[PDB]
A paper describes a structure:
The [name] subunits of the pilus rod are single domain proteins of 16 kDa with an incomplete, immunoglobulin (IG)2-like fold that lacks the C-terminal β-strand (G-strand). In the structure of the pilus rod, the [name] subunits interact via inter-molecular donor strand complementation, in which the N-terminal extension of each subunit, termed the donor strand, inserts as a β-strand into the preceding subunit and completes its IG-like fold. In 2010, Sukumaran et al. discovered that the [name] proteins from the enteroinvasive pathogens E. coli, [name], and Salmonella enterica have a second function besides formation of homopolymeric pilus rods; soluble forms of [name], independent of FimC, act as inhibitors of host cell apoptosis after pathogen internalization by stabilizing the interaction between hexokinase and the voltage-dependent anion channel (VDAC) on the surface of mitochondria. We showed that all three [name] orthologues investigated (FimAECO, FimASHI, and FimASAL) were capable of folding to an alternative, self-complemented, monomeric form of only marginal thermodynamic stability that likely represents the [name] species that acts as an inhibitor of host cell apoptosis after internalization of the respective pathogen.
FimAECO, FimASHI, and FimASAL were produced as reduced, insoluble proteins in the E. coli cytoplasm without their N-terminal signal sequences. All [name] orthologues crystallized as self-complemented monomers, and all structures strongly resembled the previously reported NMR structure of the FimAECO monomer. The global folds and registers of parallel donor strand insertion in the X-ray structures of FimASHI and FimASAL were the same as those observed in FimAECO, and all three structures showed high surface complementarity between donor strand and the rest of the folded [name] domain.
Numbering used by the authors: 3 to 162
Write the structure that this text describes.
Amino acid sequence: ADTTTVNGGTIHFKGEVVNAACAVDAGSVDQTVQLGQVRTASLKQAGATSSAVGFNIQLNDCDTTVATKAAVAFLGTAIDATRTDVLALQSSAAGSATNVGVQILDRTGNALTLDGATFSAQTTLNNGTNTIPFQARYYAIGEATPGAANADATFKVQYQ
C-alpha cells in the first residue's frame, strides 16, 4: 500500500573484533539502527540523500600503552559497481525500495568504501572508554521507488 516512501527498517551492524588495546562494548558488537521513512519525492535523482542517523562504536578498557589511535572499517555489498560506498539494501525485490541504498559516514562526514579496509578518521584514544561516532543515511542512485529498506554490514577496528 506504499506508493510514496522508502520505509526504513533497520541497518544491522555486527563486529566481533578482539584486540589487546580495548574491548568492543557489548552494545556495539550487534546493533541496529533504526533511518525511518522518506518520501521518494525527496530521493528523485542520483546523489540525493536523506535521514542521517547517528550510531557509535564504543571501546572500553582502552590502554594507551598498547595503542594510541583507533579507526573502523565497514564491509558490505555495494549497490552497484560504480557506487562502492553505498550499501545495497538486503532486498530490492517486490515490496522493497529500488534505486536507493545506505551510506556509512565517519565523524568527518566522509562516506566509507565498503571493502572492510577503508578506515574511518581515527579516535585518539584516552585510557578507558572511547566512543567512535558515525552516521548512516539514505543515498539515491536514481529515481527512488517505494518500499521497505533494510541493510546489513560488518565492521572491524584497527589500532595503532
